[PDB]
Amino acid sequence: TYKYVNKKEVDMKSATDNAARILMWTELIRGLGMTLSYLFREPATINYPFEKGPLSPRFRGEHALRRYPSGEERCIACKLCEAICPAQAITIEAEPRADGSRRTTRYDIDMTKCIYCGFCQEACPVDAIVEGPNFEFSTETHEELLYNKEKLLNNGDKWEAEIAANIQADYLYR
Amino acid sequence: QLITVDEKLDITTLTGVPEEHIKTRKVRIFVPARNNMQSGVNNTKKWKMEFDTRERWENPLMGWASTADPLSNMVLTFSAKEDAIAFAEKNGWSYDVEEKKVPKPKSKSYGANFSWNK
Amino acid sequence: VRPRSDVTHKQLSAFGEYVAEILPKYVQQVQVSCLDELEICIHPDGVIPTLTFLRDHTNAQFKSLADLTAVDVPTRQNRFEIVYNLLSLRFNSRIRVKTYADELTPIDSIVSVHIAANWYEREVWDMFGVFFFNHPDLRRILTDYGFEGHPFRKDFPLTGYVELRYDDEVKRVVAEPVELAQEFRKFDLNSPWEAFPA
Amino acid sequence: TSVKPIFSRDLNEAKRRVRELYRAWYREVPNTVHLMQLDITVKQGRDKVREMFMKNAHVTDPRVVDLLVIKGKMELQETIKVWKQRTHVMRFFHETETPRPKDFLSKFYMGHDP
Amino acid sequence: TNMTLNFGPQHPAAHGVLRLVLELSGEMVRKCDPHIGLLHRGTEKLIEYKTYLQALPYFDRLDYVSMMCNEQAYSIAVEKLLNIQPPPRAQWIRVLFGEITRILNHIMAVTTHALDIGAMTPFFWMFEEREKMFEFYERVSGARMHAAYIRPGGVHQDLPLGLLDDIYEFSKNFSLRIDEVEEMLTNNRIWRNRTVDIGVVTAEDALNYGFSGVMLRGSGIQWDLRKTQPYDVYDQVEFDVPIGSRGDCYDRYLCRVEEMRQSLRIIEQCLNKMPPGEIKVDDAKVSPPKRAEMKTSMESLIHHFKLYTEGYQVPPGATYTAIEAPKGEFGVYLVSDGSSRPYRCKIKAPGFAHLAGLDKMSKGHMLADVVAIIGTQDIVFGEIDR
Amino acid sequence: ITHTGQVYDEKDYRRVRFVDRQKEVNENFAIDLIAQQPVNEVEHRIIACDGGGGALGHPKVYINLDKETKTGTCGYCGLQFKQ
Amino acid sequence: LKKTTGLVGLAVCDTPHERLTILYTKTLDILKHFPKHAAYRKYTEQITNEKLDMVKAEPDVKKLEALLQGGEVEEVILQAEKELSLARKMLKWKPWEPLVEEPPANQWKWPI
Amino acid sequence: GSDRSRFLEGKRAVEDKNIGPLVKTIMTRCIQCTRCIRFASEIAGVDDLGTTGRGNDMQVGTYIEKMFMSELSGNVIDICPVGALTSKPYAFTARPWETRKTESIDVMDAVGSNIVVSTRTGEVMRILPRMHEDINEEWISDKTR
Amino acid sequence: HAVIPHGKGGRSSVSGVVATVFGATGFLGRYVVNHLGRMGSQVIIPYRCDVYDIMHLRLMGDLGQLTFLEWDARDKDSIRKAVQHSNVVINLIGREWETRNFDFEDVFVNIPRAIAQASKEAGVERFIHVSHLNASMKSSSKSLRSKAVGEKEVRSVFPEAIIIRPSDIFGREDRFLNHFANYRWFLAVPLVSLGFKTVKQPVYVADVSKGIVNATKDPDAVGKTFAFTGPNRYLLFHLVKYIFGMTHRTFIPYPLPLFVYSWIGKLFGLSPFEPWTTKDKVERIHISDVMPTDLPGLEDLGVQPTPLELKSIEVLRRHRTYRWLSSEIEETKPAKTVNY
Amino acid sequence: SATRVIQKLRNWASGQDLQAKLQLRYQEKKAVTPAPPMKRWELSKDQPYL
Numbered sequence A: 001t002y003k004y005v006n007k008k009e010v011d012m013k014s015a016t017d018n019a020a021r022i023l024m025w026t027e028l029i030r031g032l033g034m035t036l037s038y039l040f041r042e043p044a045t046i047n048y049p050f051e052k053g054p055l056s057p058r059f060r061g062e063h064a065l066r067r068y069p070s071g072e073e074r075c076i077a078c079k080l081c082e083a084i085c086p087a088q089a090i091t092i093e094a095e096p097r098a099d100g101s102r103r104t105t106r107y108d109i110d111m112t113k114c115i116y117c118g119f120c121q122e123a124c125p126v127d128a129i130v131e132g133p134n135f136e137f138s139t140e141t142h143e144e145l146l147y148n149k150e151k152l153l154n155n156g157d158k159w160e161a162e163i164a165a166n167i168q169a170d171y172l173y174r
Numbered sequence B: 001q002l003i004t005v006d007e008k009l010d011i012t013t014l015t016g017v018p019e020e021h022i023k024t025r026k027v028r029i030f031v032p033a034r035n036n037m038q039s040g041v042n043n044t045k046k047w048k049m050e051f052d053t054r055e056r057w058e059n060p061l062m063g064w065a066s067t068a069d070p071l072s073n074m075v076l077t078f079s080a081k082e083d084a085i086a087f088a089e090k091n092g093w094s095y096d097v098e099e100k101k102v103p104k105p106k107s108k109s110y111g112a113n114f115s116w117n118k
Numbered sequence C: 001v002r003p004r005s006d007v008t009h010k011q012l013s014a015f016g017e018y019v020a021e022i023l024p025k026y027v028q029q030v031q032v033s034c035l036d037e038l039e040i041c042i043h044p045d046g047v048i049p050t051l052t053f054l055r056d057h058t059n060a061q062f063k064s065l066a067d068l069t070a071v072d073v074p075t076r077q078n079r080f081e082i083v084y085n086l087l088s089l090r091f092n093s094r095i096r097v098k099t100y101a102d103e104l105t106p107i108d109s110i111v112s113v114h115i116a117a118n119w120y121e122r123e124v125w126d127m128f129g130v131f132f133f134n135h136p137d138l139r140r141i142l143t144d145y146g147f148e149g150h151p152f153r154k155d156f157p158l159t160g161y162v163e164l165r166y167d168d169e170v171k172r173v174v175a176e177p178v179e180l181a182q183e184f185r186k187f188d189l190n191s192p193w194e195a196f197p198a
Numbered sequence D: 001t002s003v004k005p006i007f008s009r010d011l012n013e014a015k016r017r018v019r020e021l022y023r024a025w026y027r028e029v030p031n032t033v034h035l036m037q038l039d040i041t042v043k044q045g046r047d048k049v050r051e052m053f054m055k056n057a058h059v060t061d062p063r064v065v066d067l068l069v070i071k072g073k074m075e076l077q078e079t080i081k082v083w084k085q086r087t088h089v090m091r092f093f094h095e096t097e098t099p100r101p102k103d104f105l106s107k108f109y110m111g112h113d114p
Numbered sequence E: 001t002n003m004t005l006n007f008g009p010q011h012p013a014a015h016g017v018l019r020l021v022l023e024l025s026g027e028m029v030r031k032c033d034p035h036i037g038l039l040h041r042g043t044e045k046l047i048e049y050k051t052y053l054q055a056l057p058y059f060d061r062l063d064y065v066s067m068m069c070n071e072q073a074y075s076i077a078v079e080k081l082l083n084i085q086p087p088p089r090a091q092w093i094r095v096l097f098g099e100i101t102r103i104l105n106h107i108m109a110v111t112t113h114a115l116d117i118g119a120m121t122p123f124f125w126m127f128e129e130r131e132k133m134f135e136f137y138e139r140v141s142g143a144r145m146h147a148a149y150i151r152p153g154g155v156h157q158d159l160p161l162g163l164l165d166d167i168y169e170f171s172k173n174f175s176l177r178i179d180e181v182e183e184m185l186t187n188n189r190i191w192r193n194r195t196v197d198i199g200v201v202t203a204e205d206a207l208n209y210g211f212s213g214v215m216l217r218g219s220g221i222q223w224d225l226r227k228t229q230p231y232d233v234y235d236q237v238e239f240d241v242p243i244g245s246r247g248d249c250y251d252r253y254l255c256r257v258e259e260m261r262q263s264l265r266i267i268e269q270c271l272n273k274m275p276p277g278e279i280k281v282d283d284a285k286v287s288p289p290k291r292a293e294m295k296t297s298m299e300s301l302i303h304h305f306k307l308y309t310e311g312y313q314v315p316p317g318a319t320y321t322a323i324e325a326p327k328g329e330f331g332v333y334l335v336s337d338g339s340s341r342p343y344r345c346k347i348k349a350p351g352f353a354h355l356a357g358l359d360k361m362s363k364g365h366m367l368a369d370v371v372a373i374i375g376t377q378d379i380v381f382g383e384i385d386r
Numbered sequence F: 001i002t003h004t005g006q007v008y009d010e011k012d013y014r015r016v017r018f019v020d021r022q023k024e025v026n027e028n029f030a031i032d033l034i035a036q037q038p039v040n041e042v043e044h045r046i047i048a049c050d051g052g053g054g055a056l057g058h059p060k061v062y063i064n065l066d067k068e069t070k071t072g073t074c075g076y077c078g079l080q081f082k083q
Numbered sequence G: 001l002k003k004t005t006g007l008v009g010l011a012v013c014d015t016p017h018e019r020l021t022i023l024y025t026k027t028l029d030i031l032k033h034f035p036k037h038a039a040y041r042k043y044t045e046q047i048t049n050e051k052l053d054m055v056k057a058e059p060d061v062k063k064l065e066a067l068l069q070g071g072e073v074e075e076v077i078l079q080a081e082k083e084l085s086l087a088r089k090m091l092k093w094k095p096w097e098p099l100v101e102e103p104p105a106n107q108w109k110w111p112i
Numbered sequence H: 001g002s003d004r005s006r007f008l009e010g011k012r013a014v015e016d017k018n019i020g021p022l023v024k025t026i027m028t029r030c031i032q033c034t035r036c037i038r039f040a041s042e043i044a045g046v047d048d049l050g051t052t053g054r055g056n057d058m059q060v061g062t063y064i065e066k067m068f069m070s071e072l073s074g075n076v077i078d079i080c081p082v083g084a085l086t087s088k089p090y091a092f093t094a095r096p097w098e099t100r101k102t103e104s105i106d107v108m109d110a111v112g113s114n115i116v117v118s119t120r121t122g123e124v125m126r127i128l129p130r131m132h133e134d135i136n137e138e139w140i141s142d143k144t145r
Numbered sequence I: 001h002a003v004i005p006h007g008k009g010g011r012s013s014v015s016g017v018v019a020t021v022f023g024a025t026g027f028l029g030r031y032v033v034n035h036l037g038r039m040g041s042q043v044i045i046p047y048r049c050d051v052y053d054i055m056h057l058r059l060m061g062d063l064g065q066l067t068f069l070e071w072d073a074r075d076k077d078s079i080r081k082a083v084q085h086s087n088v089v090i091n092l093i094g095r096e097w098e099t100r101n102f103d104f105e106d107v108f109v110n111i112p113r114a115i116a117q118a119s120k121e122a123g124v125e126r127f128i129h130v131s132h133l134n135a136s137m138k139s140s141s142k143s144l145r146s147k148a149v150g151e152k153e154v155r156s157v158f159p160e161a162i163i164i165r166p167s168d169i170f171g172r173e174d175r176f177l178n179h180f181a182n183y184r185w186f187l188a189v190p191l192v193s194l195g196f197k198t199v200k201q202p203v204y205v206a207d208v209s210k211g212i213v214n215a216t217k218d219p220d221a222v223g224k225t226f227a228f229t230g231p232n233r234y235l236l237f238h239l240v241k242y243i244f245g246m247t248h249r250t251f252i253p254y255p256l257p258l259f260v261y262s263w264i265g266k267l268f269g270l271s272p273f274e275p276w277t278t279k280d281k282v283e284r285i286h287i288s289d290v291m292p293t294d295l296p297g298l299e300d301l302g303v304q305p306t307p308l309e310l311k312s313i314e315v316l317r318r319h320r321t322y323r324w325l326s327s328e329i330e331e332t333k334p335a336k337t338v339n340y
Numbered sequence J: 001s002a003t004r005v006i007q008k009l010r011n012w013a014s015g016q017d018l019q020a021k022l023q024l025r026y027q028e029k030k031a032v033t034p035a036p037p038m039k040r041w042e043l044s045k046d047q048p049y050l
């Protein structure tokens, strides 16, 4: 089904109507009315520091590594978070901890390399690496953006309460 | 009408490779063997030619591996030994082909081991 | 399972013979794939003739060039596989005509047949190095002005051989051989077990 | 053997084209060094042109030579038309990069893989 | 050089990065030679080194104004090669977010067109509506733009419990917002002048230069790949293609405002008729297993591990699948060996063809005309440069 | 210092980095946290270990607490179970 | 009669039946040189003969537009002379001749 | 195999034992395929590993805990398709997709057995056999791995 | 304590030179950090200028190669921590205008002593101290003499500490070349003795830098007092005119007694904001370059000097006009060389 | 939430009711063609022309 967007007598009434449109700029005045109208509408802006634009639970934001309630870090170095990262951001090398368990000696997410796809959130079997809510982690130096296991684990501890609430809200969906 | 040239197609001059990596790079044409870990043979079918391995120094800031050799991760796959040899000659890389070695036929029969004699 | 409509598979097959008979000379293989598409494969010399017949034939009007691309099978003697995908607004359909070109054996240009190709042919030269005779203005489009090497060739390193940084001493941007701080980790992914073809 | 020609039927005819391009570049070097305010000497640049035109002196096949000038001509156009800002041109001179020695002892002293 | 003057890469007028080396006799343009590749990034070569699912995020970045519609084209393409088709609910979703995305692109194209022309209030009016839409993306995918929601076997996760209702409130009102822009530009005594009879493209020439988009539709050629070759469930909906006559910048514009209108008609339906069901194919072979299943069933873990680490393993073949992305025909020619990572993936960008036409459109035109024509082609340098 | 005791050393050429800026290390190291975890006594020969919370835990594994000699330890939680 | 065709550039052609009959008869003529059993000659002659048989048969252009499709009659005119141009081009091209050369062995084998 | 599981019932577990300092037998993984018991008897003459019991608790481990001490020992790792018993030194240092595999020669012994050195980011992670019909036909010594 | 040198030689590679460089922000400095960073050396740049000014140095260093530390000359503790983990210390602290809170002694002798002093306490393998060429303990300019005083002292705080002694330096952003070229504002360009009998031998900045860097990575230089000089000497007359030549601005060399002129230097010196000329500068300008009879610098340390005319075009280009901006050095006439 | 007078100034100046759609969100052989020729599209009944 198609439609003609712009597909198209001369009477004094008509012409006089058209001439007035050109002479007294009638349509131009119409446009001014629209903007005057909004001037009276409430502005939609938010005080940025005081009020924050709403983000729902799936917002990917900043990477964090979670820990079991007991205190044992969740990651068991299966290293498929490294395998599915599209940007090659996550670098993981591991060795058996004295406990005999399997843990990552080095876990480095290069956030400048990361494109925040959220697949790592997806891929982890123990769900140790999660996309944390925080989006405000702008840093003065490039090195700060590169993150080792200690920063991510620390990021995980700081935001664990909200991360747990967010995963709680969205796990049925996944 | 066609013209005659006995010159081995060498197109090293058009490929656009830095001089150092055309005269110092030896590539090996080999059919990949099978990780003994798995018994599947679908990765031992096509010939591959792989450039010689180069420096992989540790990075001071993060400890990540760092490489200065561009042709390192490149492994081209060629269906037959003849075609792979051709790629090396026209691109000017040195080649050292390794003959495919396929498992020799082995005679097996469940009845044979039941032989107390042997 | 996709909703295949055999009605199509047949009609396009029938056209494939039609074209094969109409141009016995250049068509080497004509095949209707399962996705249900059609691909007429032509000798490189038939570039001009086969396209023109499709652009200007009442029973096969293929007015617009959807795309011109060149896969590179290094094993294949003729490395590049120029593929031209064309669309029929009238009869509603698409046919792909694919030819083969080696590095130093140029293909004719179809800018005459479709001017859409003026840019894509420049794109194929810049990335793969195939040359197109009779092209109005063939010159690199996507790569840097001084780039050396054709990038999408399978034999070109991803990271490439040159990268740029600003040097104070010379107060100007300056190429240097690429030095990467974490090489591309080349995960081997192929599984040693195949899938019994249906 | 048995290969279809690209632009010339024989090295001889091909060489004709190389001569033309050399001339082109030779006549152009001075202009570029002035329209780009490059800090190089026309003589110096003209030697560079020679360098390149000979770097590929070994090619014996006619087809390879023909493409080489096509490509060469394209480079000329760019330079002549200011499309290539200085950064692009000076790159030819490899001014910033540190030259590497080719002496074996030199390499031994510096790199694992020479 | 007839005063050759690079339009320049840094120019508010030039979306993104465009050097238009133009030779202008005073204020008349004699020849426009657009330069491209200022945003080439390697998207086509990079994909060869990545698995099918880890190359999905590249498609969102190819033309990111239209974030998802692009993802649908790769999806469809990978589904065809596997001969798998998405579940019924997923199809409607893709059409729901497919259209929402069309609006997002048109709000971008119409309002950014005006900002270059000099009208700045339409952009702020509709960017607030855009904002509200982004929020749909975020509450469905997690990202405001660059979602990665439409994956090769359906969408990733069902809609949140409540989104449909809000994609209604918005739709119920957005119309008035389009109406307003109108009272500001459709009949402005001045919009018409700078747009009318500028960049007229004949019908035969538009097909010849491969325009394939509103640009064709604006010239009166009737072609909407969504009606001619239906993809997903765009067949079950009913919409009217907005064909145009006297094709020129003004007419095509009117067409883009009309598809904003028609997309609200398609969105309404999708909300009215979206089926109960699953949002991803049930073949653990192609779609990753649900996390409750992979954590309780061995076959699901094995399928989760192999899918994320190795990949789909698409059967060998090649396909060109084209949808009707907001800009025009977006197609992926995806050649594929039996491997889990693709072999080639030429992205046909509605935009590589349109820019080429800049020369044949802007002839004997003033500097300001060139600015108007780049706007009427909705050039996003990501798709052109790829 | 850290988990695997990273100690850029007094003579390293990298310890230079922390000068005027602190290092990222962890309190409540995990190495000791599960060791601080009580041994989950059980009646059955074999026991499961969802990690706690099902979908929000680890792929469920069944541990054989069959020998008091050894408290089975799920390879995922490091939780010792006392038969 | 009509005011204008949908397509922007195309212009209404008065005496459309006459214009088509001129073009259609010409093509038939050019095809007369093609080799006798040439595939293009037999196929296009069949298409063109049916087209003008319909053009001669129908005196109403609107029904003529329905009978040979073609959308507007003006397009059919463009398609016919486009074909007339190619018919002249193919006579020079001589596509009826045997295949230029066989493809190199394994040139068309996709699994690789 | 199959897209999904129907085993809504419970699983079994066996008890990890010590087969030595080289092979980590997390044998709850075992698919009772008896290739170990063969190799350990046919390729190497150890004849120690054996099946014990019947039913679904047939566990293929040494009845008394006697370590599997023999050369040719590490091959069991390579020959068990399941990861029940795997290498203890290379326990968790890597994961195979990452390992870049370079084909080289055994220098520890004079048989010159062919071997593949699996290197990740520039340090060798494992050396596993690659087949040479004449010299080492898929097997390598405990020393050279 | 060392770092095996791995890599191919460019950025993102390692050379194993951790080096504190206290006055890096300087014209010479900028260059020193450039090569050190190019080579891949670890560079610690102490700074007391604001962070905005130190930004230019960030980009030439690779990620983690450059570390910036807050440091105050009067505060001994700041120097202490800077050299804590460095094994090479390079001192480029210098100024031409005695500032209100820092005297020539401080910038040349006092501070550069404390620095090397700590460096020893730290155990740095080598210290490179830079003092101006022809620096007698009796030279007229307080600056030169004071510098001489330093090169002695630092020996006692740090024995076998290399002491490169550069001539006035030729480079973009240098004074030697720009100063004269900027005399344009002055209608007349005073030149003591009408610019005669003060033969001068300039040296390209890079040559100096490369030389300095090479010192850091060579055992041959210990206690050495190298003198980077140049590829050709010049009577100040040709230099001045040549400059004006490339700048394409007229030249009126005017004789003016150094007596009266020392006074002009005093006048600018009076100015609060970085006096443009310095009574000492004036004297230094006229102090004739000394001939070479000392430890060879360039070439000896591995870099062949670069003639002034070669790169002059780049340094003096900014001073040309709308059209003169397009002239090149070889159509221009190079001035004669007076060895005297 | 705006005085009706100010709100009116809005509706009047605009010419439609913004109150209804507010900016503040609240809680021999045959010649064979490739496929049968496409049927020309029907005029949209709900609005054939704008």
Ligand SMILES: NC(=O)C1=CN([C@@H]2O[C@H](COP(=O)(O)OP(=O)(O)OC[C@H]3O[C@@H](n4cnc5c(N)ncnc54)[C@H](OP(=O)(O)O)[C@@H]3O)[C@@H](O)[C@H]2O)C=CC1
Pocket: I022, I023, I024, I025, I026, I027, I028, I029, I048, I049, I073, I092, I093, I094, I095, I096, I102, I106, I107, I130, I131, I132, I133, I165, I166, I167, I168, I169, I170, I174, I175, I176
């Ligand atoms: N042509 C030349 O300049 C020649 C120089 N030399 C010597 O070489 C050295 C380097 O020369 P150049 O770089 O031009 O000198 P500069 O005038 O550029 O100063 C060098 C550095 O020293 C720092 N500095 C100066 N005063 C102090 C202070 N009181 N406390 C701490 N830091 C200070 C400055 O930093 P900031 O400005 O941030 O305080 C500056 O970055 C000089 O010491 C000079 O004596 C020798 C011969 C010729």
Ligand code: SF4
Pocket: A074, A075, A076, A077, A078, A079, A080, A081, A082, A092, A123, A124, A125, A126, A127, A128, A129
């Ligand atoms: S996937 Fe989750 S668990 Fe496995 S490694 Fe990456 S993070 Fe650690």
Ligand code: SF4
Pocket: H029, H030, H031, H032, H033, H034, H035, H036, H037, H060, H079, H080, H081, H082, H084, H085
């Ligand atoms: S081989 Fe591995 S799996 Fe087969 S039985 Fe011996 S151990 Fe169990």
Ligand SMILES: [Zn+2]
Pocket: F049, F050, F051, F058, F074, F075, F076, F077, F078, F079
């Ligand atoms: Zn557990």
